[PDB]
């Protein structure tokens, strides 16, 4: 009797490319490409397990632009320059970026602490600040190759910084090829999402928010977004086909977001399986075991992720010693294995790039220990999405209706339903009436609404500038 374990690592960035200048206004796609997007599939070269990945089309576009040398990334330009050529504004931006990342374990360099404690920085100090900001985002592969430069910790020269940059761009240029390779070798399945990561259930039917939050106020949806919902899915299928040569049959719904209407749309678009969150199952049925394959109206297969396990990795284990965290995770799988007489399917689904910056050494000791341990436990079989979809010796159940929601508490409150988020929707609704190009689709991405109307939010003004620039461009 096996336990079937399915990892599905979701990779996404909103479009940081300002449409009028072409400038990438934040470096997050670059930094997660060099830290996570190559290295997460690359674990499959060293560990004999299956791991699955979701890549959004808008992320793929940006990886392609960086790989082609075409991305004009304003923060990265300030890193590359000789410090003697740095603008006053660029020095301020380098300092602020460091301050915002300062407490993350991947920034634990003694030299960064000294530099931040200085009033004015000379050329040699700025070179270290530039290069250490680069090296903080070093991924597993290059932590081996650049080991000696990493152990320097200070006193970096322009030549050394340029060397690091060249190795980083080499990783980016190989990234889409590693996803093709692990897919063709059967080491994992690759899925995609509707193109700009929108909330499909809201685009199809804004009133579905009232299934979980009846007291919420929403704007007047005086225009239909239903055909845009279809476009996001269709364009995503075409982009995936561009990269991999086949149409996708698995999709990750952005924010785990499903509704009866959304599931019908994914079925109509030829999607054979998706996953969503355990809270949706709990809201939709009484007997909510997430260890079964579900069939929605015999049209599409649905798995519900194990929320506990997914959130342990995504939010809890950064605060743990790595061996203890692996012991805890394996112990939880053992208890699931002992708790049922059938073979349970255990979906672990979360973002593949967001939690690691908070782990010691970018979570590399944790993942290496976790993957090494899993590959030797003969009662665990990790599966591709294709294998999870086909497995005959699992329990199944038919489901006829779901209550619409997301993996955020089963509801949509992170993107709609307060004064400030509703103004964004009102802006989008009015722009849609006058839209003349697909930049309206860019503005439908979930990220813009995530950041709106939130205190904290690092670089909130940049996301607001991007959203409103896409809204403006869509009407020209
Ligand atoms: O400067 C701002 C900000 O920018 C950059 O962050 C990027 C991310 O790197 C990028 O991935 C993208 O983030 C979006 C995710 O792609 C999207 O999936 C969603 O992820 C949020 C988390 O969702 C789940 O967590 C849920 C819990 O499970 C549940 O308990 C409850 O807590 O709710 C959570 C959902 O809200 C996944 O489990 C978890 O792993 C995900 O992390 O939304 C993201 C935001 O739209 O885009 C952002 C920028 O928009 C930069 O990389 C980051 O450090 C920086 O602060």
- Pocket flag, ligand 1, residue 408 (CB < 6 Å): yes
Please give the DSSP secondary-structure letter assigned to residue 359.
S
Q: Which of helix, strand or coil describes residue 205?
A: coil
Q: Are 246 and 190 in contact (CB under 8 A)?
A: no
Ligand 1 centre distance from Cα of residue 112 (Å): 26
Residue 421: closest CA among 434, 411, 407, 433: 411
Q: Is 184 exposed, middle or buried (0-12, 13-18, 19+ CB in 10 A)?
A: exposed
- Count the Cβ atoms, other than its own, within 10 Å of residue 308: 13
Contacts of 94 (CB under 8 A, 6+ apart): 75, 78, 79, 86, 126, 129, 130, 133
Residue 273: closest CA among 254, 250, 247, 246: 250
Residue 351: closest CA among 241, 252, 224: 252
Please give the DSSP secondary-structure letter assigned to residue 215.
T
Between the alpha carbon of residue 117 and those of residues 110, 120, 131, 200, 315, the distances in Å are 11, 9, 17, 47, 30
Q: Which of helix, strand or coil describes residue 306?
A: coil
Helix spans in 185-259 (H):
200-204, 226-244
Q: How far is CA 16 from the centre of its chain?
A: 14
Q: How far is CA 66 from the centre of its chain?
A: 18
Q: Is 466 exposed, middle or buried (0-12, 13-18, 19+ CB in 10 A)?
A: buried
Task: Write the residue with the smallest CA distance to atom 24 of ligand 1.
Answer: 350
Residue 6: closest CA among 344, 427, 409: 344
Give me 55's structure tokens: 């890549």
Between the alpha carbon of residue 183 and those of residues 40, 53, 178, 251, the distances in Å are 13, 10, 8, 15
Please report which helix (H) or strand (E) contains residue 84, including its range.
none
CA distance 412 to 405: 6
Q: Are 192 and 240 in contact (CB under 8 A)?
A: yes
CA distance 412 to 255: 9
Q: Are 218 and 209 in contact (CB under 8 A)?
A: yes
Q: Are 362 and 140 in contact (CB under 8 A)?
A: yes
11: which strand partners? 55
* Residue written as token pair 């499959």: 44
Q: Which of helix, strand or coil describes residue 446?
A: helix
Q: Are 165 and 134 in contact (CB under 8 A)?
A: yes
CA distance 17 to 4: 40
Ligand 1 centre distance from Cα of residue 354 (Å): 7
φ, ψ of residue 179 to 5 degrees: the values are -70, -40
Residue 472: closest CA among 417, 421, 434, 415: 434
CA distance 349 to 148: 35
- Pocket flag, ligand 1, residue 459 (CB < 6 Å): yes
399: which strand partners? 296
349: which strand partners? 8
Please report which helix (H) or strand (E) contains residue 40, including its range.
helix 39-42
- Pocket flag, ligand 1, residue 350 (CB < 6 Å): yes
CA distance 26 to 199: 23
CA distance 367 to 322: 9
What is the stated resolution of the deposited model, in angstroms? Answer: 1.7
Pocket test for ligand 1, best of 11, 354, 355 (most atoms within 8 A of CB): 354
Task: List own/partner pairs for 282-285 with CB under 8 A and 24 or more apart.
Answer: 282/410, 283/212, 283/402, 283/403, 283/405, 283/410, 284/399, 284/401, 284/402, 284/403, 285/399
Closest ligand 1 atom to 31 CA: 52
Q: Is 360 exposed, middle or buried (0-12, 13-18, 19+ CB in 10 A)?
A: middle
Please report which helix (H) or strand (E) contains residue 115, including its range.
helix 110-116
Task: Write the residue with the smallest CA distance to atom 20 of ligand 1.
Answer: 351
Please report which helix (H) or strand (E) contains residue 3, including its range.
strand 3-11
Q: Are 112 and 98 in contact (CB under 8 A)?
A: yes
Ligand 1 centre distance from Cα of residue 115 (Å): 30
Between the alpha carbon of residue 17 and those of residues 56, 79, 206, the distances in Å are 16, 18, 28
Q: Which of helix, strand or coil describes residue 475?
A: coil
CA distance 100 to 84: 24
Between the alpha carbon of residue 310 and those of residues 25, 192, 307, 330, 400, the distances in Å are 31, 19, 5, 13, 26
Pocket test for ligand 1, best of 14, 28, 33, 133 (most atoms within 8 A of CB): 28
CA distance 301 to 296: 6
* Residue written as token pair 């605060």: 319
Strands 300-305 and 273-277, bridge-based pairing: parallel
- Give the total residue count for the chain: 476
- Pocket flag, ligand 1, residue 27 (CB < 6 Å): no
301: which strand partners? 273, 295
Closest ligand 1 atom to 314 CA: 40
CA distance 265 to 232: 11
CA distance 440 to 432: 7
């Amino acid at each position: 009797k096996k336990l079937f374990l399915v990892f599905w690592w979701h990779m996404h960035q909103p479009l940081y490319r300002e449409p009028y200048t072409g400038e990438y206004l934040l470096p997050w796609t670059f930094f997660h490409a060099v830290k996570d997007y190559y290295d997460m599939p690359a674990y499959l070269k060293d560990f004999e397990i299956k791991l699955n990945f979701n890549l959004t089309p808008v992320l793929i576009d940006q990886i392609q632009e960086y790989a082609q040398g075409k991305a004009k990334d304003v923060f990265l330009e300030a890193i590359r320059k000789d410090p003697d050529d740095l603008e006053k504004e660029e020095v301020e931006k380098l300092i602020e970026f460091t301050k915002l990342n300062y407490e993350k374990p991947i920034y634990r360099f003694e030299r960064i602490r000294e530099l931040m404690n200085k009033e004015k920085l000379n050329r040699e100090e700025l070179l270290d600040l530039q290069t250490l900001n680069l090296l903080a985002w070093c991924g597993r592969t290059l932590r081996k190759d650049l080991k000696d430069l990493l152990n320097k910790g200070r006193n970096y020269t322009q030549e050394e910084k340029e060397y690091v940059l060249n190795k980083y761009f080499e990783i980016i240029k190989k990234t889409l090829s590693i996803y093709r390779e692990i897919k063709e070798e059967g080491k994992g399945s690759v899925s995609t999402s509707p193109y700009y990561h929108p909330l499909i259930p809201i685009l199809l039917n804004p009133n579905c928010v009232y299934e979980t939050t009846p007291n919420v106020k929403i704007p007047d949806f005086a225009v239909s977004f239903r055909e845009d919902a279809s476009k996001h899915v269709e364009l995503a299928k075409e982009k995936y086909f561009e990269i991999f040569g086949e149409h996708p049959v698995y999709m990750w719904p952005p924010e785990a977001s499903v509704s009866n209407e959304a599931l019908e749309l994914y079925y109509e678009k030829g999607i054979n399986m998706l996953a969503t969150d355990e809270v949706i199952l709990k809201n939709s049925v009484e007997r909510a075991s997430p260890y079964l394959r579900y069939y929605f109206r015999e049209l599409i297969s649905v798995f519900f992720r194990d929320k506990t396990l997914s959130d342990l990795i995504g939010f809890s284990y950064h605060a743990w010693n790595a061996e203890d965290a692996v012991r805890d995770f394996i112990g939880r799988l053992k208890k699931i294995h002992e708790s049922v007489d059938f073979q349970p399917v255990v979906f672990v689904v979360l973002n593949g790039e967001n939690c690691w910056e908070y782990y010691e050494e970018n979570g590399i000791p944790f993942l290496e220990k976790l993957y090494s341990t899993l590959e030797k436990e003969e009662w665990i079989e990790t599966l591709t999405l294709e294998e999870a979809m086909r497995k005959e010796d699992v329990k199944t159940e038919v489901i006829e209706s779901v209550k619409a929601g997301t993996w955020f508490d089963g509801n949509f409150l992170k993107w709609i339903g307060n004064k400030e988020k509703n103004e964004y929707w009102k802006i989008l609704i009015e722009a849609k009436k006058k839209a003349k190009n697909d930049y309206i689709l860019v503005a439908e991405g979930s990220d813009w609404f995530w950041w709106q109307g939130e205190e904290k939010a690092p670089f909130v003004e940049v996301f607001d500038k991007l959203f409103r620039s896409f809204v403006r461009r869509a009407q020209e």
